[PDB]
Design a protein around this ligand. Sequence first.
Ligand SMILES: N[C@@H](CCCC[B-](O)(O)O)C(=O)O
Ligand SMILES: N[C@@H](CCCC[B-](O)(O)O)C(=O)O
Ligand SMILES: N[C@@H](CCCC[B-](O)(O)O)C(=O)O
Ligand SMILES: [Mn+2]
Ligand SMILES: [Mn+2]
Ligand SMILES: [Mn+2]
Ligand SMILES: [Mn+2]
Ligand SMILES: [Mn+2]
Ligand SMILES: [Mn+2]
Lengths: 335, 335, 335
Amino acid sequence: KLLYTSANFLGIPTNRGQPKIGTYQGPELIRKSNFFQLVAEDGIQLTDCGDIIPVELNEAEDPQRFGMKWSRSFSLTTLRIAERVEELMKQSNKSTPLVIVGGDHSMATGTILGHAEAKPDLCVLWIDAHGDINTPLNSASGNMHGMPLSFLVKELQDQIPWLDDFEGIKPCLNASNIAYIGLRDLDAHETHDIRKHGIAYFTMLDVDRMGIEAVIKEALLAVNPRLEKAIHLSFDIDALDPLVAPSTGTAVPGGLTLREGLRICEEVSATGKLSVVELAELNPLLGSQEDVLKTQSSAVHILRACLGHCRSGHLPFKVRNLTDQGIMSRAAHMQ
Amino acid sequence: KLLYTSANFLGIPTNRGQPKIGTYQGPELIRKSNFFQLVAEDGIQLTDCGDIIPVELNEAEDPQRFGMKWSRSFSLTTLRIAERVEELMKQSNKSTPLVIVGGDHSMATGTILGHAEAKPDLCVLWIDAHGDINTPLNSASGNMHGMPLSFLVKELQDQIPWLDDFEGIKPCLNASNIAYIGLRDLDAHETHDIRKHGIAYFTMLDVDRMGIEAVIKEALLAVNPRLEKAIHLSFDIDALDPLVAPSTGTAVPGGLTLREGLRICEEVSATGKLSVVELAELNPLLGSQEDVLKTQSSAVHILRACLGHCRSGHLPFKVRNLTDQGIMSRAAHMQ
Amino acid sequence: KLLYTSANFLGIPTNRGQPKIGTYQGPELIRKSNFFQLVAEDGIQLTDCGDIIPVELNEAEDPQRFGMKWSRSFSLTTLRIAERVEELMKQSNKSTPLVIVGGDHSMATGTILGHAEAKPDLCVLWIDAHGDINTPLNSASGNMHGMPLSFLVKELQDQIPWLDDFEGIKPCLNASNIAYIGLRDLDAHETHDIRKHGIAYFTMLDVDRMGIEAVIKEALLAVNPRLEKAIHLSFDIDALDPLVAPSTGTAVPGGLTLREGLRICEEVSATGKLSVVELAELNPLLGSQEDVLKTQSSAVHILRACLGHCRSGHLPFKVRNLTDQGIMSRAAHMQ
Ligand SMILES: N[C@@H](CCCC[B-](O)(O)O)C(=O)O
Ligand SMILES: N[C@@H](CCCC[B-](O)(O)O)C(=O)O
Ligand SMILES: N[C@@H](CCCC[B-](O)(O)O)C(=O)O
Ligand SMILES: [Mn+2]
Ligand SMILES: [Mn+2]
Ligand SMILES: [Mn+2]
Ligand SMILES: [Mn+2]
Ligand SMILES: [Mn+2]
Ligand SMILES: [Mn+2]
């Protein structure tokens, strides 16, 4: 009755990937919700594996390099994340998905690095308004949360400056292993790199013209044709329209409806190959109290879908009956 | 030019079906709106038939029984509603639809009971995020608004405890006469009962995959194949997304857009078989002032659609002409 | 790489077309946004051509006539607008689109009059919840913003009262040159006139049943079958759902999503025939501060789409390279 009967949960409160304080509170926003209770009610055993502690150096220890802000905090955090994720995914070798709540999206370099150590043939589905694939010299902002894929993609390595402390961050993805859904705010150089290297991508224009059902099918066909590969689902909450997820740092109008977001997660979950899902860029310090509740709510529905929640209902584990309790039914009485 | 040239309007301010105070104000929220004026502007004669007074016993007279809260208030209210609705529907035997504004959804047991006395072969279209079909021993909350269909469905009667005061509540529906649209939060035992007894149901997943146009067609095909039966349309305002109907007691994200809600009502109206439409679960005491206005607005658009309002326009009853008033037109002047 | 490499921008702060103060601030709402910057970032040279000064007479000089409010302010403003637009469109005879920001929708009589002087064979795509085609004796409100097309449509001229000061407002459109998208609140007499004279129209019902992709295609087929004609795109911000454009004077629920609005503008832009786009009915004095930001944001996305912005990305004008700066890449280092 369940594709996944257990799962692990991990918080990664990254906040040095971008300048707005508050992504560090994303994991708590989910823990304070009814997520755990709802997952248990569906028959899934979810273990809270705690939080990764990011490395947050001071300004003096971590000056700008190649325009990148907090790049040594990033490289050290990346290795610490990768070790923890690798360990969890290997203890897991019905499989046991790992649910990761961020934290800004810079955590993805580490989560995918560690995941790939455990599952080298994985594919990545990146759900985001943005490409998050800027190389350091092309980034206008120097914010690491806009660069996490660039360090992982083998075809991009001639455009990444060498730094000694980045050595352990080995590019573990081919361009052919990634597919985007939800894009609507790409930087020019991202557009160039995505098209040059043939990365599968489905922008909001494609979703409008094709419909989300065909988009999901084509994205899975592009990177996981026969469902042979483990799936790393990297979900930026800002992929969803700001009407349903306002509390995030770089909101862009015209995003996925919650329903469209649910359909992506339902289909990925149903492959039986969901290995890691991470949800990035929750920021409970942004927007009104009601904005935060809407965003928390959307996130909870999304994550539950990833774990197998069905909108069309679940059957009871045990079917209750009146006679058992010694109670008289209307039907019995009429007889 | 009109499928329905007259209609009746009835308020049922039920509030003992669920614990949040304020559903009793639903009928006034519609009367205070421009609904009546707009319906008249479409050429429909709408008669306000007043309000049913619910029976609201005190705690001492109405203790919990089989976990149900306010079950004797419910049984007495149900019979009082059924008598009034039966009387109105028989005085009506182009037909004259009855528009009912609630009130929490527990009123439906009474409205359908009385409707079926006048029209025994009716079908029911239940538009709701929820199944409202819990039997009393399976209800986690004991709230009657989550159980109204269970008492009506013949196939369920071995799961309903006998109570003397429920005797006059005779099951008048077969499972084959009901179809749901909009479901996204079913309890496990509801899911079990719906599937076991073959009740037609179209959840938000079905709406996503099939599109609302096909869903409406399939729902009508399932319970009213050749448009031979009178239609009881039971519309829970919470079927609509909380972005358009926030002021309701059990809001669930990812609901029908207003447009999708309009399409259901337009198609049902256009069958010529709309006999009763009820709109349940408005609660003007929930949310901000603007939340209440949004919810009132959505409700008014929905109800107008049920009565035949066309978004593509209506023709004037009399076409005005310049010469008639002795006025010179530009065309006339140029000649 | 660009269909349009330059464009002109003009503000028309009309506010005598309707009673709510604030449409006069629409052009500033766009100038205060990041619109200009974003358009430049796409490689388009946009020239701000300033604002037209509307003629605003006093009550004594401009009494009601045929029930019309401020009709002489309207006729004088119309001629002043038409002269300015004609001059700009002729200096422009890759073409150079003119972007016009209003201002209430009464400005359209002038913008289309002047546009047609420069391009007599134009077609009009009118994106609006409303018909804006009431003739003066049928208007319930006497607000000119609800009548701008009636003065332009040749087939309607026997229903327009003659006024000497309207003489220079020559009907320059055939009914066959106009198509509506987005309608959901037509007056009865508008409905009558649209159907009688065969004006192509796609209401929200049509958008629901056909989908926006087919609607856009059919609208262009109806008025511009082989893309031979210049396009005047008249976009009332109230065509969009009040959830995305709340700050406008006559909001109607159940409108176009931003995405649907974007698709209209993208397809019109891509014809290469976009000659004028005007955006009407922004009112920054309506709604909360956040309402105004949402409305400004929607307007900016819409206008950028009209000018060729692609949600699927743009390529860089110059591709940056590491070696050029004398920087060592990871790939280089490994070798
Ligand atoms: N492309 C921009 C925005 C990055 C957005 C980061 B993301 O998708 O995690 O929110 C940048 O490089 O700064
Ligand atoms: N299934 C829940 C919720 C019922 C919701 C009631 B309704 O759809 O009228 O809002 C219960 O039995 O308590
Ligand atoms: N049909 C109404 C409303 C007009 C709406 C004007 B428009 O579309 O510019 O907002 C009237 O004549 O007053
Ligand atoms: Mn993003
Ligand atoms: Mn991201
Ligand atoms: Mn409900
Ligand atoms: Mn209900
Ligand atoms: Mn309008
Ligand atoms: Mn308009």
